[PDB]
């Protein structure tokens, strides 16, 4: 047994599990490195926590995330949340607390959602319309 | 990737099957100007004639053009699978032709005339000028002509 945790990131309906352990610094995504995420722009959106905290903190540790649910953008957001949360869990359990708390402060200074999942969920569809708030169309004459 | 400059061989609007086909646009969608020729038939014949589809119609040889129209008016000889044909199992001889520029509307006419002299429902409907495919006529096709 070597130091390892497992965390998760979430969005509307996506879930990104993330196994984090000690290794040589490979960051894979469902079979593949982080450079092949295929929006080609939220690739940079997912590089964010790495580029923020500095890649030196990823040399000792390997992350492997499995993602299911949602659509492409939501899978990306689940990925970045699971990554940041797994890093923070590692630095909480195995490394001291000061590194963890400055890491958390950096993440929450840049963007709050990196470590906590947004609360917005779909409102149900109500009859008389196609959506929740919309109604079909009134005709008086 | 490279630009052929050009020669004076280019021609604008040309003629085939009694139709003034426009040049300066690609061959397939140019030949689709011909009645009885659509995008599928045109792409297929331009493939079977060994023609570069990237080329504009206005730069082609009479060899290529006559080969193409030969394939058009005699398709089944050039391994066209007989279900591309607009008129198969025709109505009289059982053979599978392919109608073109004027034959399309003349054959449409004599079909309507067959149905009318038979006094069938579709023929009476056409003769009155109404819709035939069971569509509704209460609230659509008002300004029918």
């Amino acid at each position: 047994a070597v130091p390892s945790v497992q965390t998760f990131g979430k969005k509307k309906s996506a879930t990104a599990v993330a196994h984090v352990k000690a290794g040589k610094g490979l960051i894979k995504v469902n079979g593949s490195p982080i450079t092949l995420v295929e929006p080609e722009i939220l690739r940079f959106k997912v590089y964010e926590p790495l580029l923020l905290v500095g890649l030196d903190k990823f040399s000792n540790i390997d992350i492997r995330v499995r993602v299911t649910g949602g659509g492409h953008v939501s899978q990306v957001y689940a990925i970045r949340q699971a990554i940041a949360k797994g890093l923070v869990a590692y630095h909480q359990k195995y490394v001291d607390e000061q590194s963890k708390n400055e890491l958390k402060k950096a993440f929450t200074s840049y963007d709050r959602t990196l470590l906590i999942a947004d609360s917005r969920r779909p409102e149900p569809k109500k009859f008389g319309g196609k959506g929740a708030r919309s109604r079909f169309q009134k005709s008086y004459r | 990737s490279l630009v052929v400059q050009e020669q004076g061989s280019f021609q604008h609007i040309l003629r085939l099957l009694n139709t003034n086909v426009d040049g300066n646009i690609k061959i397939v969608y140019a030949l689709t100007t011909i009645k009885g020729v659509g995008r599928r038939y045109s792409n297929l014949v331009c493939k079977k004639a060994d023609v570069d589809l990237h080329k504009r119609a206005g730069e082609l040889t009479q060899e290529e053009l006559e080969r193409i129209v030969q394939i058009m008016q005699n398709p089944t000889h050039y391994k066209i699978p007989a279900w591309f044909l607009n008129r198969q199992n025709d109505i009289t001889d059982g053979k599978d032709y392919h109608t073109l520029a004027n034959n399309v509307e003349s054959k449409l006419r004599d079909d309507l005339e067959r149905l009318k002299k038979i006094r069938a429902h579709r023929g009476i409907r056409h003769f009155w000028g109404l819709r035939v495919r069971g569509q509704h006529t209460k609230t659509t096709g008002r300004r029918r002509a």
Partner: protein
Amino acid sequence: FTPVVLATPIPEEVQQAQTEIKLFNKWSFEEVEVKDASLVDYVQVRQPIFVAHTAGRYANKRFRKAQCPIIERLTNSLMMNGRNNGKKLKAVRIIKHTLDIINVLTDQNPIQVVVDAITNTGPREDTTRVGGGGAARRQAVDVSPLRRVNQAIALLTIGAREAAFRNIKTIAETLAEELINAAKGSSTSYAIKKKDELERVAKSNR
């Protein structure tokens, strides 16, 4: 600076844009000081972002959109007129192309260019239907910073869209030339034309 390498090879341009400085897509957010005050505190700069996409929730409270970065506001005001609703990725791509164009032309920072355009195309006076009843007319009034910014973005995007519709120029380059003409002060830009007619009407109805 350090080039560090991982078990997964992280490229050097991403390493640099990580640890050198926090850029845009590939542009710095410093050297974009606003010269005209009264729009500071409402154009959110000095909070850099790698892309203009964020799942940010600013429409819950009143003045929270002022803390949303202007480029996300521009992307957001791009996706409209129906078919294009949603599709924020296309807006982001169009924006990236547009800022590349505004760098090759007019080699200043394209972010400085767009904020200059915002500052210049902000209607300062505007009208309203006022009265105590039948005595109804178009009385002129001041315009607030936030509505100035919003109306600026609306005018820019609408002009770009109306230009790009039914012609060959891309939405990207229409937006680019519109932004540049606006930042200069042109009277060819849709936004500036609308601005000056609005201001003239306001002047006339004092």
